[PDB]
Every structure is written in C-alpha cells, then in structure tokens.
Amino acid sequence: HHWGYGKHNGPEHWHKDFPIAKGERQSPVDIDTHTAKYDPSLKPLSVSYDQATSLRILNNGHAFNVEFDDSQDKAVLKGGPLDGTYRLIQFHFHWGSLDGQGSEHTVDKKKYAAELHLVHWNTKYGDFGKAVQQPDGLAVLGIFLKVGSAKPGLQKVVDVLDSIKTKGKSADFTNFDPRGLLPESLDYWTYPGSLTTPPLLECVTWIVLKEPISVSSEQVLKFRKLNFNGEGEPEELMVDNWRPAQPLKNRQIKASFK
Ligand SMILES: Cc1c(C)c2c(c(C)c1O)CC[C@](C)(COc1ccc(C[C@H]3SC(=O)NC3=O)cc1)O2
Numbered sequence: 001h002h003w004g005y006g007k008h009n010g011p012e013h014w015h016k017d018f019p020i021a022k023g024e025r026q027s028p029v030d031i032d033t034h035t036a037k038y039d040p041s042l043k044p045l046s047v048s049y050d051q052a053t054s055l056r057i058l059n060n061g062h063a064f065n066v067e068f069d070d071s072q073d074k075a076v077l078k079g080g081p082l083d084g085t086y087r088l089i090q091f092h093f094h095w096g097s098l099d100g101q102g103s104e105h106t107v108d109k110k111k112y113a114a115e116l117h118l119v120h121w122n123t124k125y126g127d128f129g130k131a132v133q134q135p136d137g138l139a140v141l142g143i144f145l146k147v148g149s150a151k152p153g154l155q156k157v158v159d160v161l162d163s164i165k166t167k168g169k170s171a172d173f174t175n176f177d178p179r180g181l182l183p184e185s186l187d188y189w190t191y192p193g194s195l196t197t198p199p200l201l202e203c204v205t206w207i208v209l210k211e212p213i214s215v216s217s218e219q220v221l222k223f224r225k226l227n228f229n230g231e232g233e234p235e236e237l238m239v240d241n242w243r244p245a246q247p248l249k250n251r252q253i254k255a256s257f258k
C-alpha cells in the first residue's frame, strides 16, 4: 500500500508516511497574481541548455522522467533568485484526465492542463541526493501547459511514450533539446517550497514562468494513454498525477515583472 494519486493512497493520505506533508513550506501553491510582490532586485533567469545531454526516458509509475547527464556543468540554471549554479537532472510533467485540470500550481485558482517541471540541483552539494537534504538544494523551473496549437519541440517526447507505457519501462532518449519546451518570456514568480511528491522534502526554490506553452489536444491525449501500473497488471491510466495547492503559510511569492 504505497503512495500514489488514488482515493486510497492519494495526496490526502501522504501525511501518514510523510508527516512533513503538513509542513511550513509545502508545494504546490496557488499563485495569487494580485498579492505577489514585484521584486525589482530579482535578476533575469539564466537558462543555459545549449550543451544539455538527454540520456533516457523512464515511466516511474508516477510520471515519465526525461533524464540528463548531470556529471558535468552542461545544462544549468543560474540567476533569478538563485545563488550559484544548478544542474539539470530531469524533467517531467503533471497532467489531468481532462483539459480543465492537471497543473500543480494554480494562477488565481486557474488550473492548467499540465505543468512541466525542470529539476535542477545546487552543484555546491556535489550530488542530487545530498542536495535534497538542503533548504536551497533544488531549483525547479515550472512551466504551465494550455491546450491549443501543438508544441513542435514536445513531439519527440509524445512519440516515445508508446515504448514506456507501464511502470518501470525505459527507453533511450538522446539528443533531446529542452530549449524547445520554453515559452518566449522568462518572466517568473518565485517562492520557497518542496518536492510535490513524497518524500515532500522542503528543499526547492520554485521558479514558475508566467507564460504558458501551448500543446495540442492530441499531444496531451497521448500523455493520458500512459499507465501507473506495471506490465501485466490491471490498467490504471496515468492521469491526475498532480498534488493540489497547499497552504501558503508564512511565505511571500515574488514576481520578476510588473
Ligand atoms: C534517503 C534518500 C532520499 C529520501 C532521497 C534520495 C536519496 C539518494 C536518499 O538516500 C534521492 C531522491 C529521493 C528518493 C527523492 O527525490 C525526489 C526528487 C524529485 C521528485 C519529483 C517531484 S519534485 C517536483 O518538482 N515534482 C515531482 O514530482 C521526487 C523525488 O530522496
């Protein structure tokens, strides 16, 4: 009986195995656009993905992860609210059963169809496992997806999903360029938070882009054909793999823009 997104093991249950679920800096949150503070001291984000080396795509039973070589400074996030250099290790999505839900963060209580997370770790901690134990260990760049025109840079991801339908399946996934998933603007909100899945560690500086990307209905429909289950288990469609908004508590969301 392990955690997941069902009635019996979903987000409302996670606190029993992971009591920090009720902690002081949990993610995601609702971004109240009118109460976010413009912070003119916030620097532009520096996204350096020109040398990114994708390796593999994995269905881990919760989402699919596109994994990168993080053994060198190849794909790094710097600037914005960050001190030092954060190395890209993986990206994944959260999405809904319907276009009207799927994102983890909300904007004035608006849910997007999906949310992309680009996960980076602070190089001063040496390895991802050490970074997650630190309050400034991770930087996650979150990007909303809305349904409209196709995202050409997403199609290579969509097209490999048939090969990783079930939990524990992986496929080679080299030469994928994550710059093709970015919107035009790097305007962002930022706040201190957590992993949005168990173990829910409070180690993340969240950077959520204001501008969504558009994906086609056909692209997100292919996400919804994935399975939570393993091969030869009863089929459970991988949909609604999002944690709902958690209390903001004693935090202030800062905007990079007016
Ligand atoms: C004891 C121990 C723990 C608890 C440990 C790790 C190691 C090496 C450990 O020895 C590393 C990964 C991990 C198992 C958890 O790391 C994760 C990082 C990110 C995620 C994805 C979350 S965060 C996000 O933006 N959205 C997600 O779904 C899940 C797990 O934590």
Ligand SMILES: [Zn+2]
Pocket: 092, 093, 094, 117, 196
């Ligand atoms: Zn995530």
